[PDB]
Amino acid sequence: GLPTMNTPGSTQFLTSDDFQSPCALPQFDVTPSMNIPGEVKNLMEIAEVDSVVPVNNVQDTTDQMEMFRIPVTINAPLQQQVFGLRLQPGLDSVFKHTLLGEILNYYAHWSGSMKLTFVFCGSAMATGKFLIAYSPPGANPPKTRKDAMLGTHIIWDIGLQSSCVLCVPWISQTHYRLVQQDEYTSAGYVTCWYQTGMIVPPGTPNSSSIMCFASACNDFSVRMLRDTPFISQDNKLQ
Amino acid sequence: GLPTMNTPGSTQFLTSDDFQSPCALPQFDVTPSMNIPGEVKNLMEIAEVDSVVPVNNVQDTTDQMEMFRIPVTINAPLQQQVFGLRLQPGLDSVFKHTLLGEILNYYAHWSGSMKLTFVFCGSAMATGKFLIAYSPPGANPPKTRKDAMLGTHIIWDIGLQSSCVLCVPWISQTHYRLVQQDEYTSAGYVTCWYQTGMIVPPGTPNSSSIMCFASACNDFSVRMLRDTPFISQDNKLQ
Amino acid sequence: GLPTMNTPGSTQFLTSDDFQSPCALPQFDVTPSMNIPGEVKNLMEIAEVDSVVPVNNVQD
Amino acid sequence: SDRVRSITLGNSTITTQECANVVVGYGRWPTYLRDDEATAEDQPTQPDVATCRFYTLDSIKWEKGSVGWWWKFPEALSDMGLFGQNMQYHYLGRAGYTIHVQCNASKFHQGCLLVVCVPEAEMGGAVVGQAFSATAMANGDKAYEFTSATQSDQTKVQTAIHNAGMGVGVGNLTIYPHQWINLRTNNSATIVMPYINSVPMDNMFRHYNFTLMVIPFVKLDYADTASTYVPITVTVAPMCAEYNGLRLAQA
Amino acid sequence: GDVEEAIVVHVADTMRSGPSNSASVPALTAVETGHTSQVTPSDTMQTRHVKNYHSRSESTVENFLGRSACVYMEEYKTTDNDVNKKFVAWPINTKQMVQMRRKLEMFTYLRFDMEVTFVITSRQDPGTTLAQDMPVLTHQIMYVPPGGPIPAKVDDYAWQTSTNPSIFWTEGNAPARMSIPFISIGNAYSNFYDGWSNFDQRGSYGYNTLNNLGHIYVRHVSGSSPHPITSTIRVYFKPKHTRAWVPRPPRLCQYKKAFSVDFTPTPITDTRKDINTVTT
Amino acid sequence: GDVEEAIVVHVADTMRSGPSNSASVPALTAVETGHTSQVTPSDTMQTRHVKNYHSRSESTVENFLGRSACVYMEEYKTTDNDVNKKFVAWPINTKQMVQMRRKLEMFTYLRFDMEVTFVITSRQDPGTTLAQDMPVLTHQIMYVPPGGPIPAKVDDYAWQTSTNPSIFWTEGNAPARMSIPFISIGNAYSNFYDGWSNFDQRGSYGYNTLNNLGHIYVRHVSGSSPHPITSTIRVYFKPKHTRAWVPRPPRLCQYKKAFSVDFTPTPITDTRKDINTVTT
Amino acid sequence: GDVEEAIVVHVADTMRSGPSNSASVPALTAVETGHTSQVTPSDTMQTRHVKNYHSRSESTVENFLGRSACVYMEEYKTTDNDVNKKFVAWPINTKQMVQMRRKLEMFTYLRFDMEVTFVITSRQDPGTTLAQDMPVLTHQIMYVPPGGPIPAKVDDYAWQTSTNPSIFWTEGNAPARMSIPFISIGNAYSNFYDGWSNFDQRGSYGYNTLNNLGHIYVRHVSGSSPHPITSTIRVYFKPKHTRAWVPRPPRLCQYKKAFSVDFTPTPITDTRKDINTVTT
Amino acid sequence: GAQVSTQKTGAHEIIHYTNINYYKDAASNSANRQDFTQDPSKFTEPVKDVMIKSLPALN
Amino acid sequence: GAQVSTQKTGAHEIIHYTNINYYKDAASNSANRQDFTQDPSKFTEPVKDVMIKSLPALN
Amino acid sequence: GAQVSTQKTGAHEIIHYTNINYYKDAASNSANRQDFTQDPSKFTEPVKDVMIKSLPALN
Ligand SMILES: CCCCCCCCCCCCCCCC(=O)O
Ligand SMILES: CCCCCCCCCCCCCCCC(=O)O
Ligand SMILES: CCCCCCCCCCCCCCCC(=O)O
Ligand SMILES: CCCCCCCCCCCCCC(=O)O
Ligand SMILES: CCCCCCCCCCCCCC(=O)O
Ligand SMILES: CCCCCCCCCCCCCC(=O)O
């Protein structure tokens, strides 16, 4: 017949190949298709939805739900820190298990900007201002409010609108960053400080809580599929 | 299906083959290209750059840098030899490790002409003339300046222009020469002699130095890749 | 992929076959050709030249 | 005459009356980053004349026994004018450079210097293995000296001159952008270096873009004169500098 | 014309933004509406113009689920005293192996074709005497849709498939492979089923009610060595032409049952010294 | 039209030159400018007209680097008491083998696709009793991008790759092969990196900081012979579609570390009797 | 148009000839001129008209030399005490085997491409104990152009070819094969060279001076059996696209040296009883 | 019956491949992984009244 | 979707070969080793002012 | 890029075959053994003055 010669790679089984194969059930009639609501075509669509971030990981939380709410008090020194965290969406315990971190943990590289949304859940009569800042990578994280205000930041005024958005820009030397972030691909820090202080009238609770939401922007993307390290087994399930 | 028959060479692994193979990371998005300065597309571009030739290999050099400078003196016999060397760019110790010899040592055949550039690094008040000659292959290298002047040569006058170029022509019986040159593919000799002598005024050093640069012309070419013998290992690096 | 089936003679080495094979020295530049005198293209050209015949084989 | 050159950057000027041509990197002139190659999103800052100007990098002595020196950039300018301040306050940076080396001597002196800019001049330690701190090869504008003999102290780099501290033949450094100062005909060398890297921008404290080396191939010599040494001076001017990522002062 | 030549997106670019002072407040919103804010860095700080060539090609569900993953392995011996130990019988399901299970359960309904690959290896069992000569072995893989006859021993009559599809494979060749269409009675596969089997809310509960995909059987065709030999089979699934609906959050707790959602409560995440700790 | 038929240089010729007597001095130049002279033999002696058909086809970087070269080999046994000795785990890098390392380090930055080929061979270990019968062995090669789970033993759960690419290969066939795209986060691979990891100039130094390419793991799928068997794997790399920037001089000193430039000083070249010696 | 369809001689016919009586004398000639007579039977006797369909297709040099012929064989063992006996190292030449040597030396200069085929076979060495189990062996063929490094032992570093071409072949498959272009420095290969190496007519003499084609090395990749195994390799050459110049008479005396023309005088031919003997 | 279509390449640098189907069942074809359309509005903007980003969310 | 191009031959003596791509990723293609363009001016003539070979290098 | 040419047959009795080149080097092609031109005059008639067979060789 037609002369041929086999090249390297013949008879190998590569788990990510694309080849045609015979059908074991010839002329099988499949069930008609139906347009079920809520079709998802790309995982970034899932990644772009907000999810509550457990910022309050203080190592002595006897109640798990306490992790989601950030404490706030009426009387505090003029400049004081509300919270601080590292911007490692796929590695930091804060973002590790969120709806965005779970998607990232299936991939090796990521790039793009992020949205952090903060919502004030105090009384309607309470008021205050907060300074939320993003500090790009450096040798030392900010220690005081004067250090923090030198970076990207927004002044948040609490009023009828209960929510404010800090958009973390994509500032990097490389087009992509590793999910298993190392010192070479650091991403910076995020901190929140009192701007004016929280004031309340008579007959209101003396403490309030804030919550944080994390999601990706429309320029976010991922690359290089890999297996997630969060799930494992020791024996075959039965 | 389609009848076929395998021919000799099936299932072999030839290290220099050109075949298509499946991609292990389907639909991977590569980083955008960027035009970094200094793109090199052909090794001859590297080979055409000048490099300092260590001509002074006198077997008693306690200082390595002394190899690069060729001594010269004010008072010398009327005819005297400055230096002499064999024209074996890929085998001679003089040219072995230069920027041209290193490239040649990756190949088996070579052809084309060469440039030798000499620069005088004496005082501004010093003066002299030198005769630089190329003697094609023969049974005996030149012994005196009258023997040398019968071959290709140039008279070099030292003045405001500090450099002179001896272009070694391609005179050969075969289109190509072996890098591991043998007696069959000899290439000749290069020698330099005093033409008039070096003269200096009062208040100047009595000795001076010359340096040599080697490079290929625009008709140079190589052939038949091979492994270089200059680098070896005895155990796996760790 | 494309279904196929091997026929008799696969993987054999026949010394008088004509098949293409990979080149071990890709993009090698051969020396230019030169017209040397006296090219021979067919052995009958040699056979048509005269040669002396040793007829006197008389065993002594 | 083509032996005269004049360069004007910012509020500073350089004049040379006895010089060779100018070498321009790899044929590329410094330029700003384009819109289709950038990755960072926030607006850059371009100080212009405040930073793109000539800075004089201290001076050294050329003796009969000198072996060579090197400087690492942009660390050498880390504390020089507003260039240093912008380096301190920003996460990312990008700039080309103009390097001018001055060395003058009478007509009765002799000697030759090689001036070369080596991109990514990674160096090895004196003792195989081990490690050295970032003080054995860069401590500001101070110059570091090569050594004729093999280095023995484990706390510093292998300074053997004939290997250039990189494991390569010193005679092959001609492949990089370079120029020669030959006292017969030359007093200064000028090199224009574009920004060369594998990424559009990089942190100017963490990464050494390139290294400047000055090596005497033909040692200095003279006779019967009152001048005992020949000073060498280095001047550098950033070009088309821009920064990104304002993050308070930090190393 | 024989060739049909008639048969790329890139993420959004960044636009230049300057100083602003106006009544519009893009940064302020209200999450109570269930609406995710669509602000971009251009709306809260000055930005340069950037052209993005990044694409989301590798994040599509087709590529995300288009990787072969192991779903089952078992061992069977060529000769032994126990009849049940000389062949395998597996009720097809995707809940046996944790990784592919978690990948699939990120969606509620799935519809795809399937590509199945079988990897078979053999080894001689240890013993006091191993010297034997045995030709190459051959294996049979049989698929029995629900309700069909099931073999009870290695040499039963049921192995003479006249209508059940089968594959005969000889050791030393490439692994066996085939394609399977969408064989669900419903309009889509369901990973989860919050309901009962009986109409009065009794009986089996959960996904177990909708698993009626059949069985797979494997044996050595006629190999029976003087000394025992053990073979292992691995089954790999690879969805093709995938469609998914109704995404759901990834699982947090470890799996404990192959046909149940049962779990043990797990902490939300790991802890740190205090709310301000940012160092390593 | 189905066929796209729309898809050689030769070196410069030598021109005839006669006697000359003029003020032009092509031979005299000045190297101080950093300029390499462009003189040709036609400019300093009488020459004949010569047509050159020589081409520089084989000197291109594509052809220079387009040869498969070994980058790693290691051994693993089918059965043994030490768990760590039954499989391999290699952090991918190109500095292990000297020849290809030196070929690559002639350039500062490289950008290419990769073609990887695996050669696997097996041999029986010596012993007092070797008589056994064992079927053909099968091997698995697993690639784990950085941050993924790593197997700790030959029969770990991690080997059930659902997203990590893998290859299953049976002895006696052609060697395995695949293609890999340009997988660097930066715009080009960097052979050299003169910098530190931490922002205050501390920590790791050199090329070691930018090596985050992942790992490769290998094992026998299920082979476990009564007597030990040792297998060796060799990995070959072959750049494709290559581009290079900023050439640098070839190394002179021998290599001594796999992740450092450390060296011992070496003489510039070999010596000879005196500056006039020209004989053998 | 995709197909290039645009891409047989027969010997001379015999013409009818009748009686003649004339002054022309085609039969009479003079060999002293060096001219071979062109007479035909039509010129000396009456002949009939004959159409000849015979062709000289099989006498062309392309077909004459286009047959694979053995040029070298050698043996090497998988394990042994002598290091030099575990691999082969052959300086390439065509004078080793008599038949192809004589075929080639009918011409003075040749120019052709080459097709090389390798045939490898293995056998177990005899001994007092032969019971072992060994997987399939693998072999490497390495080509080293002149001047390259040469391996000194079976496990040397030189076997990690980064630029030398090589082939890895597994037993049981088709023989290895490749193509080689015209790799001579001169414009044609020379079978004979009447000259010396040194310019003063001294040193090596003959064809030995122009043989600089390189070496070929072969080894078992990693096979090392408990008991010795011997393998033999045979090399076959097959010219392609052949051109030849200056034919010379075939050799009469037997060959005695592989790199010399040395011989012993031989009689012109065999004898017979007398000049008139015509019987058997 | 041969389809010709572009194959994926990076950034902005014969980038064509040919495909033919051999089997009679559409399930036998190779994966159709060249489609890149997406629309996140179903999950990010499920509200009834359209919300303008520049305007206040409420009132 | 078949490319036809010349194959390398010596000196000045059907010298055509056919190529078809089978895979959807450009990384799967064979090496493009037929390009022979080169320009050494970047390394041999990096000076600013053009230098004429026949004229003196300086003055 | 397919060549079509006649294949050898005996005497005077679809005698066509098709060939395609797969490799980029002309050395990889198959043997070109279909050429049958020949000219023995170089060895049989090397004399300067033309000799007529019917005429006497000398005078
Ligand atoms: C939500 C999970 C649904 C899983 C659906 C799996 C459908 C594929 C079943 C294939 C079983 C038969 C394969 C082997 C057939 C044979 O050997 O001929
Ligand atoms: C400067 C040196 C850079 C080296 C870059 C090497 C990139 C290739 C890495 C390939 C690793 C994976 C190969 C095996 C994959 C598999 O088995 O499926
Ligand atoms: C007059 C006689 C001339 C003989 C010329 C022979 C030229 C062919 C040499 C081929 C040597 C290399 C073959 C093996 C290469 C490999 O294993 O990759
Ligand atoms: C079962 C189908 C086998 C097809 C074999 C390869 C194609 C041969 C015909 C050449 C391509 C033309 C196809 C077409 O006309 O659409
Ligand atoms: C996966 C592609 C398989 C292609 C099989 C060989 C080509 C068959 C069709 C004949 C050539 C025509 C190709 C074309 O129309 O561009
Ligand atoms: C590497 C080349 C592979 C060619 C595969 C066989 C030919 C397929 C296309 C059908 C023939 C048309 C060829 C042509 O257009 O010239």
PDB file of C-alpha atoms in Angstrom, chain D residues 10-158:
ATOM      1  CA  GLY D  10      18.936  69.227  31.105  1.00  0.00           C
ATOM      2  CA  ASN D  11      20.875  72.114  32.618  1.00  0.00           C
ATOM      3  CA  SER D  12      24.298  70.502  32.089  1.00  0.00           C
ATOM      4  CA  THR D  13      26.673  70.394  29.122  1.00  0.00           C
ATOM      5  CA  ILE D  14      29.678  68.252  28.185  1.00  0.00           C
ATOM      6  CA  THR D  15      32.351  69.457  25.759  1.00  0.00           C
ATOM      7  CA  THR D  16      35.226  67.374  24.420  1.00  0.00           C
ATOM      8  CA  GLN D  17      37.823  68.689  21.991  1.00  0.00           C
ATOM      9  CA  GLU D  18      39.781  65.486  21.273  1.00  0.00           C
ATOM     10  CA  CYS D  19      37.495  62.461  21.021  1.00  0.00           C
ATOM     11  CA  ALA D  20      36.328  59.581  18.867  1.00  0.00           C
ATOM     12  CA  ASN D  21      32.863  58.980  17.463  1.00  0.00           C
ATOM     13  CA  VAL D  22      29.823  58.158  19.593  1.00  0.00           C
ATOM     14  CA  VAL D  23      28.637  54.562  20.035  1.00  0.00           C
ATOM     15  CA  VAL D  24      24.865  54.070  20.219  1.00  0.00           C
ATOM     16  CA  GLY D  25      23.998  50.863  22.063  1.00  0.00           C
ATOM     17  CA  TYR D  26      22.858  48.234  19.565  1.00  0.00           C
ATOM     18  CA  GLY D  27      21.884  50.867  17.014  1.00  0.00           C
ATOM     19  CA  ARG D  28      18.833  51.853  19.082  1.00  0.00           C
ATOM     20  CA  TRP D  29      18.259  55.265  20.626  1.00  0.00           C
ATOM     21  CA  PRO D  30      16.524  55.562  24.022  1.00  0.00           C
ATOM     22  CA  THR D  31      12.783  56.166  23.840  1.00  0.00           C
ATOM     23  CA  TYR D  32       9.659  56.153  25.984  1.00  0.00           C
ATOM     24  CA  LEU D  33       7.507  53.070  26.479  1.00  0.00           C
ATOM     25  CA  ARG D  34       4.754  52.611  23.905  1.00  0.00           C
ATOM     26  CA  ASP D  35       1.064  52.085  24.606  1.00  0.00           C
ATOM     27  CA  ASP D  36       1.006  48.628  23.000  1.00  0.00           C
ATOM     28  CA  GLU D  37       3.876  47.275  25.133  1.00  0.00           C
ATOM     29  CA  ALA D  38       2.993  48.626  28.584  1.00  0.00           C
ATOM     30  CA  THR D  39       1.491  46.417  31.278  1.00  0.00           C
ATOM     31  CA  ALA D  40       1.064  48.731  34.271  1.00  0.00           C
ATOM     32  CA  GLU D  41      -2.177  50.697  34.121  1.00  0.00           C
ATOM     33  CA  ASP D  42      -1.689  53.840  36.215  1.00  0.00           C
ATOM     34  CA  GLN D  43      -0.275  57.014  34.700  1.00  0.00           C
ATOM     35  CA  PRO D  44       3.545  57.214  34.657  1.00  0.00           C
ATOM     36  CA  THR D  45       5.475  60.222  35.904  1.00  0.00           C
ATOM     37  CA  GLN D  46       8.105  61.782  33.627  1.00  0.00           C
ATOM     38  CA  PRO D  47      10.243  64.301  35.550  1.00  0.00           C
ATOM     39  CA  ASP D  48      12.180  65.138  32.368  1.00  0.00           C
ATOM     40  CA  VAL D  49      14.890  67.748  33.001  1.00  0.00           C
ATOM     41  CA  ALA D  50      14.805  67.176  36.766  1.00  0.00           C
ATOM     42  CA  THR D  51      16.296  63.686  36.324  1.00  0.00           C
ATOM     43  CA  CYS D  52      17.744  63.530  32.786  1.00  0.00           C
ATOM     44  CA  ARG D  53      21.016  65.344  33.418  1.00  0.00           C
ATOM     45  CA  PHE D  54      24.712  64.615  33.816  1.00  0.00           C
ATOM     46  CA  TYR D  55      25.936  63.423  37.219  1.00  0.00           C
ATOM     47  CA  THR D  56      29.653  63.184  38.013  1.00  0.00           C
ATOM     48  CA  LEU D  57      30.453  59.854  39.674  1.00  0.00           C
ATOM     49  CA  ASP D  58      33.466  60.673  41.880  1.00  0.00           C
ATOM     50  CA  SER D  59      37.035  60.072  40.653  1.00  0.00           C
ATOM     51  CA  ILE D  60      39.849  57.510  40.796  1.00  0.00           C
ATOM     52  CA  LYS D  61      43.607  57.382  40.209  1.00  0.00           C
ATOM     53  CA  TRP D  62      45.289  55.502  37.361  1.00  0.00           C
ATOM     54  CA  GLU D  63      48.637  54.171  38.592  1.00  0.00           C
ATOM     55  CA  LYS D  64      51.287  52.089  36.868  1.00  0.00           C
ATOM     56  CA  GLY D  65      50.001  49.056  38.796  1.00  0.00           C
ATOM     57  CA  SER D  66      46.252  49.495  38.311  1.00  0.00           C
ATOM     58  CA  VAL D  67      44.320  46.471  37.062  1.00  0.00           C
ATOM     59  CA  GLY D  68      40.775  47.740  36.529  1.00  0.00           C
ATOM     60  CA  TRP D  69      37.483  48.858  38.087  1.00  0.00           C
ATOM     61  CA  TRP D  70      33.743  48.316  37.715  1.00  0.00           C
ATOM     62  CA  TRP D  71      30.523  50.127  38.626  1.00  0.00           C
ATOM     63  CA  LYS D  72      27.020  48.653  38.825  1.00  0.00           C
ATOM     64  CA  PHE D  73      24.029  50.651  37.596  1.00  0.00           C
ATOM     65  CA  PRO D  74      21.568  52.037  38.470  1.00  0.00           C
ATOM     66  CA  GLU D  75      22.818  51.391  42.014  1.00  0.00           C
ATOM     67  CA  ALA D  76      25.706  53.792  41.386  1.00  0.00           C
ATOM     68  CA  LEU D  77      23.190  56.660  41.113  1.00  0.00           C
ATOM     69  CA  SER D  78      20.950  55.440  43.944  1.00  0.00           C
ATOM     70  CA  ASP D  79      21.649  58.543  46.061  1.00  0.00           C
ATOM     71  CA  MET D  80      22.224  61.228  43.420  1.00  0.00           C
ATOM     72  CA  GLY D  81      19.870  64.202  43.104  1.00  0.00           C
ATOM     73  CA  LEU D  82      16.202  63.667  42.315  1.00  0.00           C
ATOM     74  CA  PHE D  83      17.000  60.486  40.385  1.00  0.00           C
ATOM     75  CA  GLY D  84      17.660  58.789  43.713  1.00  0.00           C
ATOM     76  CA  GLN D  85      14.470  60.188  45.226  1.00  0.00           C
ATOM     77  CA  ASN D  86      12.361  58.914  42.331  1.00  0.00           C
ATOM     78  CA  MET D  87      14.094  55.544  42.651  1.00  0.00           C
ATOM     79  CA  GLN D  88      13.246  55.427  46.356  1.00  0.00           C
ATOM     80  CA  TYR D  89       9.608  56.467  46.051  1.00  0.00           C
ATOM     81  CA  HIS D  90       8.542  54.331  43.065  1.00  0.00           C
ATOM     82  CA  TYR D  91       8.045  50.604  42.564  1.00  0.00           C
ATOM     83  CA  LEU D  92       9.021  50.511  38.869  1.00  0.00           C
ATOM     84  CA  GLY D  93      11.496  52.398  36.708  1.00  0.00           C
ATOM     85  CA  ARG D  94      12.824  52.572  33.169  1.00  0.00           C
ATOM     86  CA  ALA D  95      15.564  54.685  31.613  1.00  0.00           C
ATOM     87  CA  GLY D  96      18.432  54.737  29.153  1.00  0.00           C
ATOM     88  CA  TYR D  97      21.849  56.172  29.912  1.00  0.00           C
ATOM     89  CA  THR D  98      24.668  58.205  28.403  1.00  0.00           C
ATOM     90  CA  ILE D  99      28.100  57.285  29.783  1.00  0.00           C
ATOM     91  CA  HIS D 100      31.077  59.622  29.370  1.00  0.00           C
ATOM     92  CA  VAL D 101      34.543  58.691  30.655  1.00  0.00           C
ATOM     93  CA  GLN D 102      37.226  61.386  30.848  1.00  0.00           C
ATOM     94  CA  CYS D 103      40.953  60.654  30.891  1.00  0.00           C
ATOM     95  CA  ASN D 104      43.584  63.086  29.620  1.00  0.00           C
ATOM     96  CA  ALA D 105      47.372  62.926  29.502  1.00  0.00           C
ATOM     97  CA  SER D 106      50.247  64.589  27.692  1.00  0.00           C
ATOM     98  CA  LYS D 107      51.712  63.487  24.371  1.00  0.00           C
ATOM     99  CA  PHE D 108      54.571  61.735  26.200  1.00  0.00           C
ATOM    100  CA  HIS D 109      52.384  59.248  28.108  1.00  0.00           C
ATOM    101  CA  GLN D 110      51.201  55.875  26.821  1.00  0.00           C
ATOM    102  CA  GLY D 111      48.401  53.498  27.732  1.00  0.00           C
ATOM    103  CA  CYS D 112      45.082  52.089  26.605  1.00  0.00           C
ATOM    104  CA  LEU D 113      41.752  51.564  28.384  1.00  0.00           C
ATOM    105  CA  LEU D 114      38.742  49.468  27.422  1.00  0.00           C
ATOM    106  CA  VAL D 115      35.351  50.979  28.277  1.00  0.00           C
ATOM    107  CA  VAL D 116      32.491  48.485  27.989  1.00  0.00           C
ATOM    108  CA  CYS D 117      28.901  48.210  29.246  1.00  0.00           C
ATOM    109  CA  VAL D 118      27.956  44.630  30.159  1.00  0.00           C
ATOM    110  CA  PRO D 119      24.215  43.877  30.489  1.00  0.00           C
ATOM    111  CA  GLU D 120      23.361  41.256  33.113  1.00  0.00           C
ATOM    112  CA  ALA D 121      26.918  40.935  34.430  1.00  0.00           C
ATOM    113  CA  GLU D 122      26.257  38.155  36.920  1.00  0.00           C
ATOM    114  CA  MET D 123      29.381  37.439  38.974  1.00  0.00           C
ATOM    115  CA  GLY D 124      30.638  34.427  40.891  1.00  0.00           C
ATOM    116  CA  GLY D 125      31.920  34.181  44.430  1.00  0.00           C
ATOM    117  CA  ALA D 126      35.537  33.816  45.466  1.00  0.00           C
ATOM    118  CA  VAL D 127      34.919  30.389  47.043  1.00  0.00           C
ATOM    119  CA  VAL D 128      32.786  27.998  45.007  1.00  0.00           C
ATOM    120  CA  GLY D 129      29.460  27.671  46.746  1.00  0.00           C
ATOM    121  CA  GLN D 130      29.074  29.894  49.795  1.00  0.00           C
ATOM    122  CA  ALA D 131      27.418  33.287  49.337  1.00  0.00           C
ATOM    123  CA  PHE D 132      28.163  36.995  49.550  1.00  0.00           C
ATOM    124  CA  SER D 133      26.117  40.017  50.567  1.00  0.00           C
ATOM    125  CA  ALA D 134      25.181  42.949  48.348  1.00  0.00           C
ATOM    126  CA  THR D 135      28.229  44.913  49.498  1.00  0.00           C
ATOM    127  CA  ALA D 136      30.958  42.948  47.738  1.00  0.00           C
ATOM    128  CA  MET D 137      29.933  44.362  44.351  1.00  0.00           C
ATOM    129  CA  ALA D 138      27.831  47.489  44.927  1.00  0.00           C
ATOM    130  CA  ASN D 139      28.040  50.093  47.687  1.00  0.00           C
ATOM    131  CA  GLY D 140      26.951  53.287  45.962  1.00  0.00           C
ATOM    132  CA  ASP D 141      29.123  55.304  43.605  1.00  0.00           C
ATOM    133  CA  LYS D 142      32.385  53.888  44.990  1.00  0.00           C
ATOM    134  CA  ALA D 143      34.422  51.920  42.461  1.00  0.00           C
ATOM    135  CA  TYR D 144      35.427  48.293  42.989  1.00  0.00           C
ATOM    136  CA  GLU D 145      38.881  47.097  41.952  1.00  0.00           C
ATOM    137  CA  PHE D 146      39.843  43.960  40.064  1.00  0.00           C
ATOM    138  CA  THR D 147      42.795  41.886  41.256  1.00  0.00           C
ATOM    139  CA  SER D 148      45.775  40.456  39.405  1.00  0.00           C
ATOM    140  CA  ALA D 149      45.986  37.336  41.577  1.00  0.00           C
ATOM    141  CA  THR D 150      43.142  34.952  42.343  1.00  0.00           C
ATOM    142  CA  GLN D 151      40.848  36.146  45.116  1.00  0.00           C
ATOM    143  CA  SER D 152      40.892  34.194  48.380  1.00  0.00           C
ATOM    144  CA  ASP D 153      38.537  36.007  50.787  1.00  0.00           C
ATOM    145  CA  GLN D 154      35.203  34.181  50.836  1.00  0.00           C
ATOM    146  CA  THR D 155      33.242  37.359  51.597  1.00  0.00           C
ATOM    147  CA  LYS D 156      33.844  38.987  48.194  1.00  0.00           C
ATOM    148  CA  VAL D 157      33.643  38.278  44.480  1.00  0.00           C
ATOM    149  CA  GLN D 158      36.290  36.482  42.412  1.00  0.00           C
TER     150      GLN D 158
END
